[PDB]
From a paper:
The first step of SARS‐CoV‐2 invasion is binding to the angiotensin converting enzyme 2 (ACE2) receptor on host cells via the RBD of spike (S) glycoprotein 16. Intermediate horseshoe bats (Rhinolophus affinis) are hosts of RaTG13, the second most phylogenetically related viruses to SARS-CoV-2. We report the binding between intermediate horseshoe bat ACE2 (bACE2-Ra) and SARS-CoV-2 receptor-binding domain (RBD), supporting the pseudotyped SARS-CoV-2 viral infection. The virus-receptor interaction is a key factor in determining the tissue tropism and host range of CoVs, and receptor binding is critical for viral infection and transmission 14, 15.
There were four ACE2/RBD complexes in one asymmetric unit, and the resolution of the complex was determined at 3.3 Å. SARS-CoV-2 RBD bound to bACE2-Ra with an external subdomain composed of flexible loops between two β-sheets. The interaction surface was distributed into two patches. Patch 1 mainly contained two α-helices on the N-terminus (α1 and α2), while Patch 2 included α1 and a pair of anti-parallel β-sheets (β4 and β5) of ACE2. In Patch 1 of bACE2-Ra, R34 formed hydrogen bonds with Y453 in the SARS-CoV-2 RBD. However, such hydrogen bonds did not exist in hACE2/SARS-CoV-2 RBD or bACE2-Rm/SARS-CoV-2 RBD complex, as the spatial distance between Y453 in the SARS-CoV-2 RBD and H34 in hACE2 (3.8 Å) or S34 in bACE2-Rm (4.2 Å) was too long to form hydrogen bonds. N31 of bACE2-Ra was also responsible for binding to SARS-CoV-2 RBD, however, it interacted with Q493 instead of E484 compared to K31 of hACE2 and bACE2-Rm. In Patch 2, compared to hACE2, residue E38 of bACE2-Ra formed a hydrogen bond with G496 instead of Y449 of SARS-CoV-2 RBD, whereas Q42 formed a hydrogen bond with Y449 instead of Q498. In the bACE2-Ra/SARS-CoV-2 RBD complex, both E35 in bACE2-Ra and E484 in the SARS-CoV-2 RBD are negatively charged amino acids that repel each other. Structure analysis indicated that in the bACE2-Ra/SARS-CoV-2 RBD complex, K353 of bACE2-Ra formed hydrogen bonds with G496, Q498 and G502 of the SARS-CoV-2 RBD.
Numbering used by the authors:
A (entry chain G): 2 to 597
B (entry chain H): 334 to 528
Amino acid sequence: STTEDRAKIFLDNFNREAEELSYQSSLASWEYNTNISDENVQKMDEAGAKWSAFYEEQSKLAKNYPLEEIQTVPVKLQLQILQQSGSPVLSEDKSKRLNSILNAMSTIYSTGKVCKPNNPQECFLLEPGLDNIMGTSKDYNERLWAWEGWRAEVGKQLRPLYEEYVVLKNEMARGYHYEDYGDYWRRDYETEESSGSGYSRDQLMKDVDRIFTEIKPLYEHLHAYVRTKLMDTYPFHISPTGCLPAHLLGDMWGRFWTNLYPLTVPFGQKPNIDVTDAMVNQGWDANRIFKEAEKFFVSVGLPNMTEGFWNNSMLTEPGDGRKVVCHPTAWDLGKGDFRIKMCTKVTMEDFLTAHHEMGHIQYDMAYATQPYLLRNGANEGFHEAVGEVMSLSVATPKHLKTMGLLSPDFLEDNETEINFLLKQALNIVGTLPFTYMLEKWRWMVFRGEIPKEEWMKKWWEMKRDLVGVVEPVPHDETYCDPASLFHVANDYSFIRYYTRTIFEFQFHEALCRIAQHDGPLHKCDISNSTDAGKKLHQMLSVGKSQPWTVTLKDIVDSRNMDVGPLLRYFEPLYTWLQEQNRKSYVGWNTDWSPYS
Amino acid sequence: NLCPFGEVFNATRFASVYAWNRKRISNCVADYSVLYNSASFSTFKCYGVSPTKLNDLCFTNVYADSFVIRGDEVRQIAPGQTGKIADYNYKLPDDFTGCVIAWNSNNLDSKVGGNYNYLYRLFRKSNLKPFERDISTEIYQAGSTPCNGVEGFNCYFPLQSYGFQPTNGVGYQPYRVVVLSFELLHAPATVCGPK
Ligand SMILES: *[C@@H]1O[C@H](CO)[C@@H](O)[C@H](O)[C@H]1NC(C)=O
Ligand SMILES: [Zn+2]
């Protein structure tokens, strides 16, 4: 028979055996996360080793089936995913050298601490020590200490490792018939197989480049508004026409400007929308948060949660002497077992987080019909985007009023919309240049466009041109400030957060159009709209079975990424930012630096 | 002369789908109303015969087939459906005249760590004929290299084990199926309803 029929037998045996080995690792990792113990750590490492060894063995066996001879589109993706994901073609010594470098980076990042001057033994860690200082302090010299200290202690150590990390990753990617490690990372968006119109790995760079040119107006006005407000807090260190100092942007790397909201709040006297105090008075518990979240997804027609989710999940901090990992996560164990590990608290944050993680489960529940290999989002950005689109509707003032959490007489002014939209833009918009720059530097480093001799030079040259952020202290090539972020030192792509922001607001406009929403996009609630859930269900069930170009076209009527919905979402803020950025310089000068 | 419907439904042991058990119910009166009214069965779909009028019909012999499958496989038992259960394990004819009854058995057939004692057939050379059983354990040849009675390269064992654990979803949970097959031939009828 044909090798296509011979391959279908190989994938049948894989899907059956993989589901049991992945379920064992998922059940073991759940036990460690819900019961921290040295014994459970061993069970988790042993179960994970069985899954990885079986995965890497079957990845070699998949290479025996030529992809050119497979005609059915599901099997081609599974064979292609299996061949490229595992089996490092690198040498025996290099593969262990890569693991030695990869494992060392996570230890220097997780255990690297910065010690205060005048107290060499009072040393602080990134969590929760250095993060609280970098997100709450208003002192220039305090933040500069934490900024440079983290850059010098953790970054300088990672510099010689990262230079060896790039060459070893490029040799690995070159084995899978890819140009460099950046090209290997960009294959998630490759709609390689289509008649024509196959979405290219290089096209993702082009479309993302276009996005930056389209979002630059809103960012340049947000950069100017933050600048004028920051000059009141930091008087003699910020230039009215220069770039923004790095250590003053609400976090260690400038990833999110949201912690600058007390310093950049448009209207201070207008009250906030926090419903946490009302939830406490109304006797809301952990069950109410997740059950009212279940009602919201049931309202749009999405399925009810499995009863196993209600009894096998850690929806609250158990206590009971059990040590747990209190980090919000959505679990797709692998055999219809869907759980959520969340040490919830009666807060608006956790109420919104519950909807964001339940959206992943609703995504996971829908694509369970597809094979195991194709059981994931179409691209990196699709998954978290779904969780945030649902979270957008539940934070609207109407939804909190309908749930009884917000008073019926709450003032809905244009003053209240600007405060909400700025807080959103400080997180949603501010990260996009930082995200574009971080991946552009890495992509260019992998491609060889930046030599190691000019690594840090181009990092800050791009920080000044693309992000508007200037180095507070001159940094030599002994540093590796890009690696000072978790995703860079832990071999994770960052372009997901760029693409997820584009797709999120594309979904939001389409579902609100279907829901016949009358008004602005930022006050939309897709609740009680069965038609919107139908379009959503068709997108979630597809997963990776269909190209993301076709999957995106079925819900938003477009085969490409479009920033229109995002810019239209922030249009009330754009017109407000433009009137207030009168009397103010909008833009930045690359040459000005706080050290000069 | 009452029909032993209690033994096949209320049985402590059920067989695997590849080795489905068949029992002849004959020479007795059968009360189909007490079975269909029981809300313990999640599936009770009769093809070719009306379930309500089952008590007022006479057949020569009644065949009760018993096996265990997954939740997502109860659809594959129905007539005219295809799949690894219908094609290689248990096939119902296109002109099937009988009833299919199933209910959830996660409380009995699921264990922590996995009940691997229930098993199925993943691969076969040809599809099974209607009402046929295959108990062969011969190694399957997928590639050109001969197996020669050894499991190995491109040589997969035809029978693989279901994995039922108590934490699975309803789709991956074990389900016990009982298939009543009705036969009418030129012979004295032995199974009839109390009339
Ligand atoms: C099954 O057993 C229960 C008692 O445990 C009995 O009430 C019921 O009638 C039995 N059903 C059959 C079909 O034997
Ligand atoms: Zn998420």
